[PDB]
Design a binder for this molecule. Structure first.
Ligand SMILES: [Fe+3]
Ligand SMILES: [Fe+3]
Ligand SMILES: [O-]
Ligand SMILES: [O-]
Ligand SMILES: [O-]
Lengths: 205, 205
């Protein structure tokens, strides 16, 4: 069964960028719920239950028809937020191979950020914006609700190994930014953990 | 050209059920934005810009994929919220023809409320919960993002004429309820304008 992962920090660690009140609720309420609903659905699926959530979401089509939707939403939700927590930290600097790779595939860090911001801002409704690695090339893609590029094109409309990502569901930014999602996206640049992204990139490049 | 309609009441007229701060932000920011993005899209579509928003959304299939998407989301947003504002009011009582029709298609008002609450709660991500009239039968359905049953089955995955509806995007309840969407849904019963719902049921158009 899945468990709510402990965070790499206290809820107020991303202040004054991401509000601690949201961090706590996002963690203990929203993320906990994805874990509970996922476990409920996995109760009658012993073989699928052993898999780490990241591997499960890559096999949604092998699940019984009546299990696909509930797990797609909740396993996706568990996997996305687990990655999200580790993908946040103050004081990091984009550098090394990840910086060079971005400049290589996007032309420059600026083209990258502008493209990411647009993807993040144009995602209508609930969803995520991602920086993924497709084989040997990085790209910016977005998914609806709790879908993940790890689920593949057929299901999520996107694909690739997620290096980093931004949650754009309104619950991730409403208490502090309300409708102003663009300001929330700007703040994200102050808390995206480039060291973790660099770590994931070194493992997959 | 569409315009942001004025509310039938003050921002605090729905309290202590729906908070005034949300009422204002939801109206002057969210709805206002759908109106603006919708007009920008219709600015290069004269043959369509003169149609009432409710009618435009039934003809989305007559638009190129690009305009279709932007209008589906924003014309839909404009139509749904214009209906929402008029569909809210305190001190009304479910009665007469509409109440008899509900008990008839659902068994009783409580059975109806329970089915509506389930539909509203189960709508994963952003979307709406509706009470629609399909021919001569009432039904409960939900749509994603700003989709409307007026768009037809193929586009929204639902159909029928909207009688009443509840917006379950998180921006509609996060400031006061945060993650507790169910408490928000329960409060809805105190502000749903049954007089206007009864009027729409009588007109059937
Ligand atoms: Fe989230
Ligand atoms: Fe809304
Ligand atoms: O989310
Ligand atoms: O809205
Ligand atoms: O909405």
């Amino acid at each position: 069964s899945y468990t709510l992962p402990s965070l790499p920090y206290a809820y107020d660690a991303l202040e004054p960028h991401f509000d601690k009140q949201t961090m706590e609720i996002h963690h203990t309420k929203h993320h906990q719920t994805y874990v509970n609903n996922a476990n409920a659905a996995l109760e009658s699926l012993p073989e699928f239950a052993n898999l780490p959530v990241e591997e499960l979401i890559t096999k949604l089509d092998q699940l019984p028809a009546d299990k696909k939707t509930v797990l797609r939403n909740n396993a996706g939700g568990h996997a996305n937020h687990s990655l999200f927590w580790k993908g946040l930290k103050k004081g990091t600097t984009l550098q090394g191979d990840l910086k060079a790779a971005i400049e290589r595939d996007f032309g420059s860090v600026d083209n990258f950020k502008a493209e990411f911001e647009k993807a993040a801002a144009s995602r209508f409704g609930s969803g995520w914006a991602w920086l993924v690695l497709k084989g040997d090339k990085l790209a910016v893609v977005s998914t609806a609700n709790q879908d993940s590029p790890l689920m593949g094109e057929a299901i999520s409309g996107a694909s690739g190994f997620p290096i980093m990502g931004l949650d754009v569901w309104e619950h991730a930014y409403y208490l502090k930014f309300q409708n102003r999602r663009p300001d929330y996206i700007k703040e994200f640049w102050n808390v995206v953990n480039w060291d973790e992204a660099a770590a994931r990139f070194a493992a997959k490049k």
